[PDB]
Amino acid sequence: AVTQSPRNKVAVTGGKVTLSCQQTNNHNNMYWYRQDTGHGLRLIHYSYGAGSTEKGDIPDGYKASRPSQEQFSLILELATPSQTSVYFCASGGGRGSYAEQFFGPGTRLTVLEDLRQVTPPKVSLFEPSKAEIANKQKATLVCLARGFFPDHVELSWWVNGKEVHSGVSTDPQAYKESNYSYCLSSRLRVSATFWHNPRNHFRCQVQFHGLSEEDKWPEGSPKPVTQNISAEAWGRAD
Amino acid sequence: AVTQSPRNKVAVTGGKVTLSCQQTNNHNNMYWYRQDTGHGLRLIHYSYGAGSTEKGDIPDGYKASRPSQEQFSLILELATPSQTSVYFCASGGGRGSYAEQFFGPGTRLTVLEDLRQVTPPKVSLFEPSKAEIANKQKATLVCLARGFFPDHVELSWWVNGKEVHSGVSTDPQAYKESNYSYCLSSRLRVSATFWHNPRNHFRCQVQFHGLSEEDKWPEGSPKPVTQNISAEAWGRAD
Amino acid sequence: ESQPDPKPDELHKSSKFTGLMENMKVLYDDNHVSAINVKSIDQFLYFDLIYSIKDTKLGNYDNVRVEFKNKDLADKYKDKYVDVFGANYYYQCYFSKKTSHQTDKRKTCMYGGVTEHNGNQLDKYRSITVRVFEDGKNLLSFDVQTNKKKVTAQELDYLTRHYLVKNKKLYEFNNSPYETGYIKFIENENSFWYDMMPAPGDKFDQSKYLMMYNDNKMVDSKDVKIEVYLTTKKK
Amino acid sequence: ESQPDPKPDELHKSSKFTGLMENMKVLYDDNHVSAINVKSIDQFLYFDLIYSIKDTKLGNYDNVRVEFKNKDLADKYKDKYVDVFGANYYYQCYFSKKTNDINSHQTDKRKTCMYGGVTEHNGNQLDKYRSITVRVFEDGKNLLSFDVQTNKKKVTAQELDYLTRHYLVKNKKLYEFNNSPYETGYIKFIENENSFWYDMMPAPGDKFDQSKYLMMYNDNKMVDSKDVKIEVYLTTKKK
Numbered sequence A, B: 001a002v003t004q005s006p007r008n009k010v011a012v013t014g015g016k017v018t019l020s021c022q023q024t025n026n027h028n029n030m031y032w033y034r035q036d037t038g039h040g041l042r043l044i045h046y047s048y049g050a051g052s053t054e055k056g057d058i059p060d061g062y063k064a065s066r067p068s069q070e071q072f073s074l075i076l077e078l079a080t081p082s083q084t085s086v087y088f089c090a091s092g093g094g095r096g097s098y099a100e101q102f103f104g105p106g107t108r109l110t111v112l113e114d115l116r117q118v119t120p121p122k123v124s125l126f127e128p129s130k131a132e133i134a135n136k137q138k139a140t141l142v143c144l145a146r147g148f149f150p151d152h153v154e155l156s157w158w159v160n161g162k163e164v165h166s167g168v169s170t171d172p173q174a175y176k177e178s179n180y181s182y183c184l185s186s187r188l189r190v191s192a193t194f195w196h197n198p199r200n201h202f203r204c205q206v207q208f209h210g211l212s213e214e215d216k217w218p219e220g221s222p223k224p225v226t227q228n229i230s231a232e233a234w235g236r237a238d
Numbered sequence C: 001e002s003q004p005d006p007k008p009d010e011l012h013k014s015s016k017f018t019g020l021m022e023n024m025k026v027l028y029d030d031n032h033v034s035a036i037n038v039k040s041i042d043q044f045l046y047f048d049l050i051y052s053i054k055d056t057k058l059g060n061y062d063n064v065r066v067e068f069k070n071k072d073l074a075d076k077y078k079d080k081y082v083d084v085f086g087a088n089y090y091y092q093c094y095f096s097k098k099t100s101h102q103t104d105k106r107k108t109c110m111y112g113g114v115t116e117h118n119g120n121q122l123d124k125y126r127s128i129t130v131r132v133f134e135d136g137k138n139l140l141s142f143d144v145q146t147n148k149k150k151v152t153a154q155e156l157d158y159l160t161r162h163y164l165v166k167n168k169k170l171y172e173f174n175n176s177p178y179e180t181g182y183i184k185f186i187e188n189e190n191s192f193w194y195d196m197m198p199a200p201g202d203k204f205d206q207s208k209y210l211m212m213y214n215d216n217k218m219v220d221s222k223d224v225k226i227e228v229y230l231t232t233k234k235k
Numbered sequence D: 001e002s003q004p005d006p007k008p009d010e011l012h013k014s015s016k017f018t019g020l021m022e023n024m025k026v027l028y029d030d031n032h033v034s035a036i037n038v039k040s041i042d043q044f045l046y047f048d049l050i051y052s053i054k055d056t057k058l059g060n061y062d063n064v065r066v067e068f069k070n071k072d073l074a075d076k077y078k079d080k081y082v083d084v085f086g087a088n089y090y091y092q093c094y095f096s097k098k099t100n101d102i103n104s105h106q107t108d109k110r111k112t113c114m115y116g117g118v119t120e121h122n123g124n125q126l127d128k129y130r131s132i133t134v135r136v137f138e139d140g141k142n143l144l145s146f147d148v149q150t151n152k153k154k155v156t157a158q159e160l161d162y163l164t165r166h167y168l169v170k171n172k173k174l175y176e177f178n179n180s181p182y183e184t185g186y187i188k189f190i191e192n193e194n195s196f197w198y199d200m201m202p203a204p205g206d207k208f209d210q211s212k213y214l215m216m217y218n219d220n221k222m223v224d225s226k227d228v229k230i231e232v233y234l235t236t237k238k239k
Helices: B192-196 C022-028 C071-077 C153-168 C206-213 D022-028 D071-077 D157-172 D210-217
Strands: A002-005 A008-012 A017-023 A029-035 A041-047 A063-065 A073-076 A085-092 A101-103 A107-112 A122-126 A141-148 A153-159 A162-164 A168-170 A175-178 A181-188 A201-208 A228-234 B002-005 B008-012 B017-023 B029-035 B041-047 B063-065 B073-076 B085-092 B107-112 B122-126 B141-148 B153-158 B168-170 B175-178 B181-188 B201-208 B228-234 C033-038 C048-052 C063-067 C082-086 C107-111 C114-116 C121-134 C137-148 C150-152 C178-186 C191-195 C218-220 C225-232 D033-038 D040-042 D048-051 D063-067 D082-086 D111-115 D118-120 D125-138 D141-152 D154-156 D182-190 D195-199 D222-224 D229-236
Touching: A002 A085, A008 A017, A017 A029, A017 A085, A017 A107, A041 A063, A063 D022, A122 A201, A122 A228, A141 A153, A141 A201, A141 A228, A153 A181, A181 A201, B002 B085, B008 B017, B017 B029, B017 B085, B017 B107, B041 B063, B063 C022, B122 B201, B122 B228, B141 B153, B141 B201, B141 B228, B153 B181, B181 B201, C022 C153, C022 C206, C033 C048, C048 C071, C063 C082, C082 C107, C082 C153, C107 C206, C114 C150, C121 C153, C137 C150, C137 C153, C150 C153, C153 C178, C153 C191, C153 C206, C153 C218, C153 C225, D022 D157, D022 D210, D048 D071, D063 D082, D082 D111, D082 D157, D111 D210, D118 D154, D125 D157, D141 D154, D141 D157, D154 D157, D157 D182, D157 D195, D157 D222, D157 D229
Parallel strands: A008 A107, B008 B107, C063 C107, C121 C225, D063 D111, D125 D229
Antiparallel strands: A002 A017, A017 A073, A029 A041, A029 A085, A063 A073, A085 A101, A085 A107, A122 A141, A141 A181, A153 A162, A153 A201, A168 A181, A175 A181, A201 A228, B002 B017, B017 B073, B029 B041, B029 B085, B063 B073, B085 B107, B122 B141, B141 B181, B153 B201, B168 B181, B175 B181, B201 B228, C033 C082, C048 C063, C082 C114, C121 C137, C150 C218, C178 C191, C178 C225, D033 D082, D040 D048, D048 D063, D082 D118, D125 D141, D154 D222, D182 D195, D182 D229
16 A cells, blocks of 8 residues: 555745655665646656656756655655645556556645635535426435635535445645635535435535644634534425 | 557558557556657547547647547558657546556657668677776676667667576667667676686677568569568687 | 427537537447347336347347336337337446346346337338438438337437448538437428437437437328438538 | 876866765765674675674664675675775665575565675774864865764774864865865875875766765775874865
8 A cells, every 4th residue: 555644735935845655565676756737747757766856847846755665755845835745656567667566545736825814614415406407306405515724624524423425526636716716516416305304414525625733824813723614404395 | 458559560651540549447548649859748639438538738739539438549641750659558547647557558659751761770789898998897798789760679688598687788779870870778787707717608699670571572683671680699618 | 390490599519519529429420229029028017117128240249228208108008019219328227237137247227119010011112202402402311111000209319320420421520510400200291300419518318319209209101201301511 | 195196177077966965965965874893794795794783773774785886895804893984875776685595595574785894893992082173174264174084093094084074064065965065185094104185076967876886995995093084175165
């Protein structure tokens, strides 16, 4: 397995950021990439074994270290906005040999020149209508998170205190509703009887990742240390 | 499994080219990327399921088709030198979600304005000297493949009929020695006694992939259908 | 006319779509579902019907889920021998899973396209005529055959667009030679039309587009005049 | 002097190396091999000795393969209680595989390699830690000088060199991730009238071979802890 730490991170310009990667595959090679909408997956630095650190396509602005067989760290000593991206770790076969590599879950990293820009989301439940179309049903309940920044969020459905996956339609990726604000939607298509069952409890969870204890929160204003927000509702009459 | 067809292909500018991909993972999602030394792995076109074709980072000049769950083809109707690259197919999880995807072996494609430019490599065995430095040993045996084009080659070492890896120091990638000619070297560091043992046999293999039965060869000149070239040697006196 | 005609500025402009026309094209290519004199073999939801229809050629499916606009339509055709014909999709074709379930291996989805078999057949193949105008100029016209008395608009829409794709490059991999286009189905005094171009954006949903056929709207093969209006690209 | 001093145009120029100086820095960081009063437990090739040295800290190894310049060196220390100290590597560290049916091996899990760094234990110990001095010159200008402790009579050059470059790295940024603040450099070990020096910079190119570099230590060159004067000569970058 390939683990990445942390999974999300928002930092200020000029600060030092370190992303760690742990593997349990006992693989000699380890890699550090960065994915950007537009460009592809670019190699930053890679390793041949403990004590080895070779440079990839885009090494400028980053350092690395392979202290052991299981660890390969990426280091940003002077964080710049330009380093905002999703970082992927991997281990396994050779360079360019993707069929041999094992990727990690990716790390969302946003470099802001002011943490005061971080804001939690606004989650809400809705209900569409067939009258708005000449089609059929489309979707029953609708969840929408907006007004958050950066885009470090996860949306899930839980009916009756149990997470569901049937009939869930979430946006592939949060869209920017303004210069410093994101949006994200989802829909849950359930049976009219279930929805009309006043005993059923629906819930839409949204995981927003912001500042932590390690983050230098400029005091004064309330520290955006929010977490899981929920939009809950019950069944309505027939 | 994710199979790519063909594995290697050299074509003329203006010609049509189609790369096929066959998966046995029953994955809804499939992708077509291109690896470039400098650029990373860029998505050209992807699919969400049969009959689905979405455009990636660089759709330009490429078409595609997902006729079934197992097939996803990349189509180059007007092949160009610019499309010279190694292409990778994948299937599985979401776009940008590499931990879920499964890649294929890759396909080398070169687009040249004249198939007659295709020439097999020249392989030879050498030996350096300590007199050639104020350092130590560097490397014992040296192999050099040159005068080949395109750069679809693989070099390996086989001591006594067995492929070795210990002490192999191959070039990261072939270099251009001229407008239409590639070079590629490798080094095999062995023990003085080993090399001096006249009973040991060394071998430098070079796998060149040129035209094939499917390739239209301009009748007249010999069709470059070579394959594996080797440079062999035996241990020399103390 | 019954349905108000599409005003010029109501039609989808193909240039506003930037996400591969191949997704539309695919729907009107040589492939489509067709079943004659069959009975539903299962049902997923109250508004659909699972039909055992094998993809004799391509072999992409064994079962076809036919979703309707309402429960009435389904119940009405539930356990009734009908004929099926329509443009299907796979992407968001979610259904059953395993026994209201059934279906083992290969499956596809579609909307409407259901018509009774008995008392709807014809000895000789009917031949409706399509009048396609390109900027008003009626340069093209062709016939669309069939042998059903009450033929669905969907079957005709597929049949009509199919001709256009192969002969007029109606839909191409990335876009189309036409800016706007709509097909008008006229019966007696009543008429209804469909927008042939995708909605604005960079992505096309085959499932939502096709859903326009869930009403299972039928047309009388003797009282039907089809007319296609297209506007060209001002190059 | 015994070994002719490094002619200016003989030293490697750091700027000619374009391949991440981190591979060199790592060899002189706080980590290194060290064993006290230990005997070899095996041998891969006639010119090496496998020892049971466990990395109590990082846990990066369980066995250490010490390679020598010649079989004589191996046999000399084979089955002799010694002390081991040196800059190890992992990348191209191939050895044994599994004690075999013809191949004299063993080594179960975690392993590394190194060159020389061996000295007898008994009669080589000192009650008090000896303190050698290092004279570092940055363009002739002797701006820095510090001491290097040890407690062996016949200490290897490798041990002193490591101990010397180590301090330099942390205090003078001798080796950095990408490059170095110095164009050239060499460490001069002067005993009596005899003296030898080591090129501190990597060979030209875009890749650093740690295995080949450390190989300069296979001679197991020792030096008298009382008769040693260390001098480092570095050339700064002309910014």
